[PDB]
Ligand SMILES: Cc1[nH]nc2c1[C@](c1cc(-c3ccc(S(=O)(=O)N(C)Cc4ccccc4)cc3)cc(C(F)(F)F)c1)(C(C)C)C(C#N)=C(N)O2
Ligand SMILES: Cc1[nH]nc2c1[C@](c1cc(-c3ccc(S(=O)(=O)N(C)Cc4ccccc4)cc3)cc(C(F)(F)F)c1)(C(C)C)C(C#N)=C(N)O2
């Protein structure tokens with residue numbers, strides 16, 4: 001007693017919009033630092049009937065029965081996860097149930113500190129996440145600033161983490177958790193020094209490595225696992241998995257942490273796991289461990305370095321004057337345009353990037369940069385030599401933006417009026433579509 | 443720079459377990475009240491490349507660009523949702539971003555009351571959810587009893603909501619939210635009397651209709667939308683959708699609620715939505731509105747009534763002595779066996795059901811019932827006449843359970859020892875597998 005006819009027949013209206021979405025992705029230079037493209041195997045898992053199963057609890061300690069094949073899936077996911085990040089299952093545990101990165105962080109913080117507990121993270125404006133304690137004068141914007149008592153440390157005027165300030169804050173504020181690992185930070189992190197501060201104050205060290213996970217896995221950047229009590233990561237960014245997350249906890253350094261984190265995930269916050277997600281994560285975590293994926297991750301860094309260099313060669317400034325990872329933050333002040341304006345221009349030409357604050361922006365009302373990253377275009381086969389074209393396109397867009405602002409004014413309402421029907425953008429859009437459209441697409 | 447080998451080739455180990463999981467679902471009489479089987483169209487959506495897109499915020503108010511087709515999908519999902527539950531978009535709004543039921547509820551509760559806010563829900567043991575404020579004297583088990591101050595009302599000795607108790611408690615406790623709608627409640631709810639109590643104390647009315655959502659939609663049961671401030675529902679149980687959830691909020695009764703709920707979901711709790719989920723929900727909410735799905739929902743009720751009646755005809759007792767909805771709770775005291783024991787027996791015969799507390803249970807360590815429901819088996823094409831066979835299988839399992847307890851003792855360790863190799867269970871399993879295997883399968 002059900003309908004079995006395909007999506008195209010069952011719901012033509014939805015299928016058209018989806019096929020358009022697919023056309024837009026195929027014909028876009030995607031530079032969103034946190035985005036990637038899943039292969040067809042990850043997506044076969046996500047559409048698997050394993051999501052019919054209610055399997056609350058954990059393997060072998062399940063509330064319901066019928067869970068033998070689910071238990072093997074979740075266990076194959078935890079194992080593949082600890083292996084992928086080169087940690088021993090005797091020293092480290094992992095939870096594979098968090099539904100996304102924000103959930104994973106809120107659950108992990110709760111486990112460590114509880115309600116009213118004190119936390120320290122990087123301010124949003126300097127490159128931290130919303131879930132690292134973010135608030136405004138006007139509001140406790142993240143539950144992490146409301147259910148917990150948070151204090152935020154800023155980067156310096158050059159965009160680097162200021163460890164002397166983190167200490168100044170940590171010693172006076174006395175948090176139980178200090179969060180490092182960030183959303184738009186173009187450099188590597190000094191975890192040993194974070195660990196040194198956390199010891200002085202008796203705090204936990206929490207590393208959120210969602211943006212740099214593949215670099216940590218493949219041994220290309222610093223290893224937070226040598227120093228952290230807790231490491232979280234999303235599975236969908238550079239890792240190229242499904243939308244999901246992982247919480248790692250150090251058993252050796254804190255026995256009884258396994259119970260705290262597991263119980264924080266369920267039943268404190270979640271109910272039934274999404275086993276299609278867990279399967280998909282298993283599938284990608286296998287690919288992660290292969291030598292082919294290390295080559296991909298290496299290619300991501302090489303592209304990022306070449307893109308930075310090509311941008312610098314065209315007199316464009318970068319926060320920290322370069323990158324050690326997959327992402328670049330462009331400082332647009334010298335052209336006297338906002339990131340908000342350049343995003344709009346880049347949209348008009350099928351270039352996806354996002355506006356991003358730089359250290360000299362006091363408010364975040366109007367950020368003065370944009371964030372770009374290479375994992376998505378590296379997945380589509382772009383090599384170092386293709387980065388000059390991407391830089392060329394970005395430089396042409398910055399220039400068009402400057403032209404449009406002269407003609408239409410500095411107010412965003414007015415600026416956008418210039419965007420439709422500009423001949424240069426249509427020319428450039430066309431060039432983007434031809435190059436993007438022919439690249440491999442999983 | 444990716445691997446596009448299919449799942450079977452790319453990862454043979456995972457694919458084996460999945461196909462096994464598939465076979466077990468096909469060969470099981472599934473009576474878990476909260477489970478169902480998604481059609482191929484819902485599952486195509488879940489495997490769609492739309493989950494590559496980061497789309498933080500809400501339609502027309504996104505942080506990033508390239509979100510035009512995502513905006514159409516999310517807007518179509520909201521529209522189809524409001525329509526399905528026969529509410530005007532002028533008076534009701536809906537948020538379609540919650541990743542699951544428990545998230546939906548913690549988010550909605552937070553929006554209404556905030557941290558340290560007072561809430562009232564049905565105790566777990568009486569049929570409420572974990573997220574309705576569940577705690578133990580030992581521990582604040584749900585985040586809903588820790589980030590909020592919760593009070594729990596019990597059902598009477600017959601399994602019914604005692605409204606006089608709800609008023610006694612509401613007048614003295616003075617909560618700002620009272621939660622109704624339940625996880626194992628076999629009867630319809632008197633929302634008007636809840637609304638009367640809520641007005642009497644100035645509290646909000648929160649209806650969680652996850653288990654009865656289709657009955658509310660198809661106009662078979664009482665309509666909470668006539669009386670509630672907030673209605674939440676999962677999309678994966680009787681509704682037959684993906685694993686996701688919906689928060690409905692009454693604008694007319696509460697101007698300013700829309701901002702509170704929307705901001706509670708993001709950026710308070712969540713980050714990026716899962717667009718494959720939102721797509722999947724759109725796809726199912728269209729099926730929901732059709733008359734064919736009303737025929738399904740009616741068939742669920744007819745099967746549930748026939749199953750209750752066939753169990754009574756075999757001298758098995760039910761909590762509340764019957765059902766108004768899709769689920770039954772069997773009281774096993776007269777056979778001197780625990781639900782825990784009957785679940786194990788039913789597992790051995792490919793009958794999925796779950797143990798469940800009854801009013802006479804105090805400790806909750808060993809519950810004296812099992813909960814069964816009909817949505818899953820109704821989706822597989824069972825009709826009223828088929829419920830006699832299900833009732834006969836369940837009565838035989840109860841009897842075998844009784845026989846095993848006498849031979850092996852009343853301790854669960856010992857009981858299990860009797861289970862493998864028992865000729866009657868193997869004969870009964872065989873019968874189940876044959877009947878189940880032949881039923882239609884989406
Ligand atoms: C969206 C998001 N999530 N996590 C991230 C980012 C971005 C980010 C967040 C925000 C943000 C997100 C939420 C708030 S808010 O306080 O919650 N509120 C909604 C303000 C508001 C009120 C009315 C109308 C619009 C906005 C405030 C700021 C803003 C930006 C922008 F570029 F606009 F300045 C960027 C970024 C990667 C998109 C980022 C930065 N920079 C980093 N570090 O982390
Ligand atoms: C799993 C779950 N989620 N929401 C639901 C249900 C069930 C439920 C929850 C629980 C439950 C879930 C969590 C806790 S706990 O306090 O968090 N903790 C894990 C202590 C513990 C540890 C080991 C053994 C017992 C207790 C306590 C009890 C127990 C049952 C049982 F049948 F055993 F009594 C049932 C049910 C649908 C499975 C249900 C009932 N009855 C209803 N009303 O709501």
Ligand SMILES: Cc1ncc(COP(=O)(O)O)c(CNCC(=O)O)c1O
Nearest residue numbers: 034100101102129182183210713714
């Ligand atoms: C460091 C970090 N942690 C957690 C999250 C949350 O993941 P979910 O979106 O799955 O909740 C993000 C997402 N950051 C968004 C971006 O960089 O575009 C992140 O950058």
Ligand SMILES: Cc1ncc(COP(=O)(O)O)c(CNCC(=O)O)c1O
Nearest residue numbers: 271272476542543544571624625652
């Ligand atoms: C009334 C109610 N509300 C919320 C939820 C939470 O849904 P998620 O599992 O998607 O978090 C449940 C699940 N109850 C589980 C069961 O009846 O088997 C529920 O019964």
Ligand SMILES: [Cl-]
Nearest residue numbers: 046277488719
């Ligand atoms: Cl999903």
